[PDB]
Design a binder for this molecule. Structure first.
Ligand code: MG
Ligand code: MG
Ligand code: MG
Ligand code: MG
Ligand code: MG
Ligand code: MG
Ligand code: MG
Ligand code: MG
Ligand code: MG
Ligand code: MG
Ligand code: MG
Ligand code: MG
Ligand code: MG
Ligand code: MG
Ligand code: MG
Ligand code: MG
Ligand code: MG
Ligand code: MG
Ligand code: MG
Ligand code: MG
Ligand code: MG
Ligand code: MG
Ligand code: MG
Ligand code: MG
Ligand code: MG
Ligand code: MG
Ligand code: MG
Ligand code: MG
Ligand code: MG
Lengths: 45, 331, 294, 165, 188, 273
RNA sequence: GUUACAGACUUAAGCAGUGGAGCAUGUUAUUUAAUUCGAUAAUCCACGACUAACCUUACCAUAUUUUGAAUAUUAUAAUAAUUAUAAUUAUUAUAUUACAGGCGUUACAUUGUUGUCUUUAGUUCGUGCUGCAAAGUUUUAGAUUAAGUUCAUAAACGAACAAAACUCCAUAUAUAUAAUUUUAAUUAUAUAUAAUUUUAUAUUAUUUAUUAAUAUAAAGAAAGGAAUUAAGACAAAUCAUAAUGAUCCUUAUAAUAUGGGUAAUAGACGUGCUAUAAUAAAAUGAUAAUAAAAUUAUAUAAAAUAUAUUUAAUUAUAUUUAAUUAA
């Protein structure tokens, strides 16, 4: 799906799977059960 | 008919108008001596089917999202080329395009089907050629109803009608499904089909008798070559009054939809938390022209009556996963 | 066989003539021609294959298998209509069935009228025009089986002409309540009766008839009194043509029993003046009518 | 019903469908030409490239295509137009295909082994080893140069270090 | 008067005609395999017709034995090994043999059939050629010249309106007829 | 012309339907690369009466596109037309599949009727190579549409007695072939697929045959007259096939018991018509 | 823990077994750093698992990675291709919002699938009628059938999912194909026909041949197996095929490597293998007594050789690959 934009910029498509994924993460964000912030390696040693 | 008294010993269901060829029972139609090549072709077929599923949905703006429902792709591999075949339905029919303003612009769906084959170098067939190493063509076939294919019917009710059964099946929605087709008399249609076939056979048989009895009253015994030759006469009289405008349509099978059932099983209704199944059985689910006449039913994949076209599609709602199972009978 | 150019050049397209000539010069004449009944290759009808039939041959420009139109010579661009529509009359309507038409705006009264005329001798026009529909008892009725609770819709309706006839009908359905009303409308038109009215306005005298557990006390009314009765009786009267009445319901007040009782009471509890006079051998005179006479 | 416009089937058109392995050497030349055409990415099995499309002329026949190890996403190369397209036509492939030439490796004589070692018995054993490896490697599908490298390494001439180890 | 139907369209309605074998030396053995029989038989019939009109004696589709592969699998997803299900696949095979035909005519036949192939059918071709006990393999320059001459003569066009061409055919012919082929063999 | 859609300057005067078809083709083949041009409008505007669309609407449909159609319509199509009752004007999918089957069948009948007879112009008489001159048979294998590795295999088969060898050389040849020669039928047999092309395998087999012939004809050193011919491999092979080498005894036959043709008066009298 | 009627390898009879011995395998229990998880009455226990040395593998120990496996957003730079040294594009690398990932919990939130009742005969609808109505009828007095199968009477007349039939393997026959060196034609596979057998006689009980079972006769090649297991119930099994809802982890409950474990053994347990000798074990049997169905481009591997090993044969390795990518 990612390559469709390269070949056919004119027509817009929707990836129902990715949209469902982003909808679910946003719902969890609103509900408060979001993903914890991952800590970088630079932290501590 | 069961009698067939005035015809003679014969019978050929092998007509391409009375039986579905068993090659069509499979989504990928290929034989390769190199089995590894056969496996990779099958995998590619499945992948490209999923890609086309991704491709179908389109949007013009935030308030315009157009889902184009399509059936499973029928991949036809020949020694030289591959054809991808599928039926599709476009809900955005725009008053059946009654207004002529449609002639001056291409909607998203037209552009999608055009880039399928027509675009010169950037069409999908070129990329699919790279994957398959042969000529590739795609057949989009339009369906004007959604209940003419089990695939399209299940997909539509599973992807486009969430609001109509999310909290129970609505009365109007349940009524529309039950009135998609007029209640037809399966017995009458089956008997009419049998009588028509009998009439065709009698007409041909009479043509034989008339031709051979006279044959312009010139050809006689010791001249017909009764040992091995079977040349009875001119082709004209073999099929007198048996032409393309009367024979083929009335021998075509699987014309009418007599029975159809839909089953909404899943977590649709927001009950205490359990699951519910709603079934809508309308019509009959057996073909009456197979047990009275002499044609015999063939079981697709050795487990599906030919007259039955069934399919189920899943999706996800707020509660989980649900499945819409549609089974259709085509007399 | 072995036709010359006569009757052949003028019947087959010119480009196809060389192939015919080669076939004649290749296939030996007087060659026996078996018929193969292990494999089917030719159509079950005679056809010369000279013309590309729409709907029975591949459409030119369609990207199909056995499409010889290269890859950039496909001549289909508008995928909006159904390519290759049905031939001939353009439809496959089987004999004995009719093309569907407006059904949402088609009144169910017309369907009831047509069906009743089909089975009984009643005419449709009267049912459609001069009969009034108004339901009385709509409710969900439940029976439980091994499967579980099975819910059914029970509808009771009345039909009348506001001119003397009224009917009562009850129907049950599990599909929906519209069907229950349809059956009730069907039954009620089937069960029509004639109600005698005094001056097309009110009943004769008072009625104290009892239906099972329902005690119907009905008494006549003055001109211009109005229907001062229970709503079930009010509906029955308004559909039956009664305009002035007064009464009270005692003991059970079940709506459906009330409706059945009042219809029966109108039918048989009351007696017309003429019938009383004839069976009595006496003359009954309406003082009101004879006071205002000429 | 539109008239049927017959188009004569001619051998030139029916070419590109000739069997790949056919006894006649004319077929060998033709199949070699087709092989050279398809190895050069000339447009077959697909529509040709002309100048009409300027920014949407893509090809996916990069060497990485199909392979895994050089990890990268789908390369969308800029396809050449129908003109200014090159054809390889390698002479080695010609002899390999049109003619039936085969190298058959190069045997090792005791002179070479004696250059390295001095014990006659070891020289005899090494000769036998070189013979065995020579006769057991010509049937393995690999490149000529790699096959020669393995042949030398196993025989004894080149040290194991020549391979990637 | 009435419509006439010449032999070409009369022959379509009858079983394909086979030319007789006169000498008996095989030149090809084409085996068609499919997982079904209807397409296989239809295509076979077409092969016989194409061979006959091309002058190639063909014997006809010989029913070689079918191959039945069989697999077994438990119906249940997790644990019901008691319930099992059998699956099978059938390979329907036919054989057609060509005799007493020149190589180029056989090439013409095979090309045509592969061009007009059908879904589901696979074809494997065995070609037999008789040769000397000893052949001259070093004769290249004269051999290449004669081979190029033969290619040019065989794929030589006469008409213009008919005889549709192929772009690949033109490219191959121009490459073969290009003078730069001569230096290809001059590597010695 | 094939490129007529590319040039809208020459569209002037063309019929409105052809103009519309050309305009559709141009914006279907170009795709995202399509760009509007004034000449295309002028050509399109001439078709206003053909399709009964006001000129200003054509301008807005050319420019705004599907958005133009939406805003001239005045409102989206708000109706669940999907569940519309059947008009009996279309066929189900399986019926269409049956139709397509017939379409292919008619295509092949037409091909056989008209295109195939044109193949009779390439008939050629079989120029039979002399069996004596050409005893060796090479078998080539090809898989149409595949890349099966067995396509490289070549098989060489020839009878030893037709090699043209003297008795001593023939015996030496037979005993040097070892398992590759079967005395029962006297056929030499040899295949090669080590090399990756059929041409290489055929050359390899030919060279091996020449090498064996040369050694067989060289009787200066040893003619291998004493060593007999070994046939144990053939014995093993033949022991894996069933021997139906029994025939009906000659002396059990009684030809006198066979039926004799009877007298058919009608058939006798029909010979003279 | 209610009555009556029939079936079914439930029982009775017969053959072979298990329970007893040794071993293989699954389970329990226990041990262990881990002995990963699930199944566990019929309906678990050579079950998921069609092969646990490493992999697999999910567990334990020790080391190691941190936007990772994708999708999107924003900068920096490099390479390749194509057009006339530039322009465009595609990719790569480095970052960050952003998550990704989970064989972690919930089959008592689910989709799909499956086991048992079950080859069981049941489950429903339209119009009509009965009862004020919920409902009832049809779906039954009485029989028959494997069967709501088929009759007889009957407010009922029909119809739908199941039953049966069509279907597949097999069978008999006809036609066609095969140059009978792919041979076997005693075959292969395409189409069609055939039977859910018919006819006659008699002896029976009967609604009186407007009939059933008993036998006979004669016409037939004619006799089987497989698939399909409805509605509902078991909150039966499955979150370890896969997928999603909710909840939980995010330098760790995610990812990699080297070893170990899944193979431990008091007891117990379900399946099987091998035996306990003469209606039974062992050797030998080269014009090689007699099969079917399957496999061989991620190969099958003959014949001949050296070996143990004596002349040889048989048996097991090694040497070498004959032919075949297959009637
Ligand atoms: Mg009340
Ligand atoms: Mg064999
Ligand atoms: Mg017992
Ligand atoms: Mg014990
Ligand atoms: Mg024991
Ligand atoms: Mg042991
Ligand atoms: Mg365990
Ligand atoms: Mg559990
Ligand atoms: Mg490990
Ligand atoms: Mg997640
Ligand atoms: Mg984990
Ligand atoms: Mg459960
Ligand atoms: Mg479930
Ligand atoms: Mg009532
Ligand atoms: Mg019952
Ligand atoms: Mg034989
Ligand atoms: Mg059944
Ligand atoms: Mg059930
Ligand atoms: Mg029950
Ligand atoms: Mg539970
Ligand atoms: Mg778990
Ligand atoms: Mg999972
Ligand atoms: Mg971890
Ligand atoms: Mg274990
Ligand atoms: Mg078990
Ligand atoms: Mg013993
Ligand atoms: Mg066998
Ligand atoms: Mg067999
Ligand atoms: Mg051996």
């Amino acid at each position: 799906f990612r390559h469709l934009k390269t070949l056919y910029p004119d027509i817009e498509f929707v990836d129902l799977e990715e949209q469902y994924r982003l909808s679910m993460v946003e719902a969890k964000k609103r509900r408060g059960k979001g993903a914890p912030k991952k800590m970088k390696k630079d932290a501590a040693a | 008919n069961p009698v067939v008294h005035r015809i003679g010993p014969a019978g050929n269901i092998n007509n391409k108008l009375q039986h579905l060829n068993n090659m069509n029972n499979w989504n990928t139609q290929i034989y390769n001596y190199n089995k590894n090549m056969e496996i990779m072709n099958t995998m590619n077929d499945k992948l490209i089917n999923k890609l086309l599923y991704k491709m179908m949905t389109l949007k013009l703006n935030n308030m315009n999202i157009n889902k184009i429902i399509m059936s499973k792709t029928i991949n036809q591999h020949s020694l030289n080329k591959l054809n991808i075949k599928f039926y599709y339905y476009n809900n955005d029919i725009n008053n059946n395009n009654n207004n002529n303003n449609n002639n001056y612009y291409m909607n998203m769906m037209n552009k999608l089907m055009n880039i399928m084959n027509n675009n010169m170098n950037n069409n999908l067939c070129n990329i699919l050629s790279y994957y398959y190493k042969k000529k590739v063509t795609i057949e989009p076939i339009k369906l004007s109803y959604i209940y003419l294919n089990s695939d399209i019917f299940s997909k539509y009710i599973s992807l486009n009608d969430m609001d109509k059964y999310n909290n129970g099946i609505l009365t109007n929605y349940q009524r529309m499904l039950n009135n998609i087709m007029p209640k037809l008399n399966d017995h009458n249609i089956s008997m009419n089909y049998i009588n028509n076939i009998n009439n065709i056979n009698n007409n041909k048989y009479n043509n034989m008798i008339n031709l051979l009895n006279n044959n312009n009253n010139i050809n006689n015994n010791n001249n017909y070559n009764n040992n091995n030759n079977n040349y009875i006469g001119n082709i004209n009289n073999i099929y007198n009054n048996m032409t393309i405008d009367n024979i083929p349509m009335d021998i075509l099978m699987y014309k009418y939809l007599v029975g159809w059932s839909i089953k909404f099983k899943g977590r649709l209704s927001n009950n205490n938390g359990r699951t519910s199944t709603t079934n809508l059985l309308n019509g009959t689910f057996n073909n009456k022209k197979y047990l009275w006449s002499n044609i015999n039913n063939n079981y697709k994949l050795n487990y599906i009556p030919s007259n039955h076209n069934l399919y189920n599609n899943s999706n996800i709602n707020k509660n989980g996963k649900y499945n819409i199972k549609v089974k259709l009978n085509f007399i | 066989q072995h036709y010359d150019e006569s009757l052949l050049s003028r019947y087959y397209p010119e480009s196809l003539l060389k192939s015919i000539k080669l076939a004649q010069q290749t296939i030996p004449e007087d060659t026996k021609f078996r018929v193969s009944r292990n494999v089917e290759f030719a159509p079950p009808y005679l056809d010369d294959f000279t013309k590309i039939h729409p709907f029975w041959d591949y459409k030119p420009g369609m990207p199909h298998l056995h499409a010889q139109e290269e890859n950039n010579n496909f001549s289909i661009f508008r995928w909006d209509q159904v390519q290759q529509p049905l031939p001939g009359e353009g439809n496959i309507l089987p004999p004995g069935v009719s093309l569907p038409n407006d059904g949402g705006r088609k009144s169910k009264s017309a369907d009831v009228a047509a069906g009743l005329h089909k089975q009984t001798g009643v005419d449709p026009d009267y049912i459609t025009r001069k009969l009034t529909m108004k339901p009385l008892v709509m409710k969900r009725v439940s029976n439980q089986t091994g499967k579980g609770k099975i819910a059914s819709f029970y509808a009771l309706v009345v039909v009348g002409d506001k001119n003397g006839m009224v009917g009562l009908g009850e129907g049950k359905s599990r599909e929906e309540m519209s069907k229950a009303i349809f059956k009730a409308h069907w039954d009620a038109v089937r069960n029509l009766k004639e109600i005698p009215r005094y001056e097309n306005r009110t009943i004769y005298g008072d009625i104290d008839f009892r239906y099972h557990g329902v005690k119907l006390h009905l008494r006549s009314a003055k001109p211009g009194f109005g229907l001062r009765v229970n709503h079930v009786i009010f509906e029955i009267c308004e559909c039956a043509g009664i305009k002035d009445l007064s009464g009270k319901v005692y003991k059970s007040r079940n709506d459906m029993n009330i409706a059945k009782g009042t219809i029966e009471a109108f039918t048989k509890a009351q007696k017309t003046l003429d019938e009383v006079a004839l069976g009595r051998g006496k003359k009954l005179v309406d003082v009101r009518k004879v006071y205002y006479s000429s | 019903s539109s008239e049927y416009v017959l188009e004569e089937p001619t051998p030139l058109s029916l070419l590109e469908y000739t069997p790949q392995v056919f006894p006649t050497k004319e077929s060998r030349l033709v199949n070699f030409t087709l092989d050279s055409l398809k190895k050069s990415n000339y447009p077959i099995y697909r529509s040709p490239n002309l100048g009409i499309l300027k920014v949407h002329d893509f090809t996916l026949n990069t060497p990485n295509f199909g392979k895994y190890t050089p990890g990268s996403s789908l390369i969308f190369a800029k396809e050449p137009q129908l003109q200014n397209l090159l054809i390889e036509e390698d002479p080695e492939d010609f002899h390999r295909q049109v003619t039936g030439e085969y190298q058959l490796l190069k045997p090792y004589v005791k002179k070479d082994f004696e250059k390295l070692t001095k014990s006659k018995d070891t020289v005899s054993k090494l000769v036998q080893n070189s013979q065995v490896v020579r006769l057991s490697l010509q049937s393995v599908v690999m490149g000529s140069e790699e096959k020669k490298l393995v042949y030398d390494v196993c025989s004894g001439m080149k040290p194991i270090s020549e391979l990637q180890q | 008067s009435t419509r006439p139907y010449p032999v070409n369209v009369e022959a379509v309605y009858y079983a394909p005609l086979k030319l007789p074998i006169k000498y008996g030396d095989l030149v090809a053995d084409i085996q068609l395999r499919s997982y079904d029989n209807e397409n296989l038989d239809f295509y076979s019939d077409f092969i016989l017709r194409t061979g006959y009109y091309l002058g190639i004696p063909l014997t006809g589709p010989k029913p070689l034995p079918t191959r039945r592969e069989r697999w077994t699998v438990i119906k249940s997803p997790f644990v019901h090994a008691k319930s099992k299900e059998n699956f099978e696949r059938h390979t329907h095979k036919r054989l057609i043999r060509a005799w007493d035909t020149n190589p180029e005519v056989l090439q013409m036949l095979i090309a045509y059939i592969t061009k007009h192939s059908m879904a589901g059918v696979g074809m494997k071709c065995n070609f037999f050629q008789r040769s000397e006990i000893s052949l001259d393999l070093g004769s290249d320059a004269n051999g290449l010249e004669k081979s190029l001459s033969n290619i040019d003569e065989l794929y030589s066009l006469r008409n213009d309106d008919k005889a549709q061409t192929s772009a690949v055919g033109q490219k191959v012919l121009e490459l073969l007829d290009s003078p730069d082929f001569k230096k290809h063999l001059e590597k010695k | 012309s094939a490129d007529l859609y590319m040039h809208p300057e020459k569209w002037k005067g063309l019929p409105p339907q052809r103009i519309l078809e050309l305009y559709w083709e141009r914006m279907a083949r170009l795709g995202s690369e399509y760009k509007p041009n004034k000449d295309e409008l002028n050509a399109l505007l001439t078709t206003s009466e053909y399709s009964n669309v006001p000129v200003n609407d054509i301008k807005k449909l050319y420019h705004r596109g599907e958005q133009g159609a939406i805003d001239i319509k005045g409102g989206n199509v708000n109706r669940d037309n999907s569940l519309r009752p059947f008009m009996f004007d279309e066929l189900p999918s399986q019926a269409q599949e049956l139709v397509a089957q017939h379409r292919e069948q008619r295509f092949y009948n037409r091909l056989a009727a008209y295109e195939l007879p044109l193949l009779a112009q390439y008939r050629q008489e079989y120029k039979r190579p002399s069996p004596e001159s050409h005893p060796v048979t090479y078998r080539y294998t090809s898989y149409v549409g595949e890349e099966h590795p067995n396509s490289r295999k070549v098989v060489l088969s020839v009878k030893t007695k037709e090699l043209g060898l003297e008795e001593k050389s023939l015996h030496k040849f037979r005993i040097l072939a070892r398992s590759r020669y079967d005395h029962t039928t006297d056929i030499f047999k040899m295949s090669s697929d080590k090399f990756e092309h059929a041409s290489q395998n055929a050359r390899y087999l030919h060279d091996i045959l020449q090498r064996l012939l040369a050694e067989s004809k060289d009787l200066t050193e040893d003619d291998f007259s004493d060593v007999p011919l070994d046939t144990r491999h053939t014995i093993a092979k033949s022991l894996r096939k069933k021997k139906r080498d029994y025939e009906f005894p000659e002396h059990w036959k009684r030809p006198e018991d066979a039926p004799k043709k009877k007298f058919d008066i009608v058939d006798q009298l029909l010979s003279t018509l």
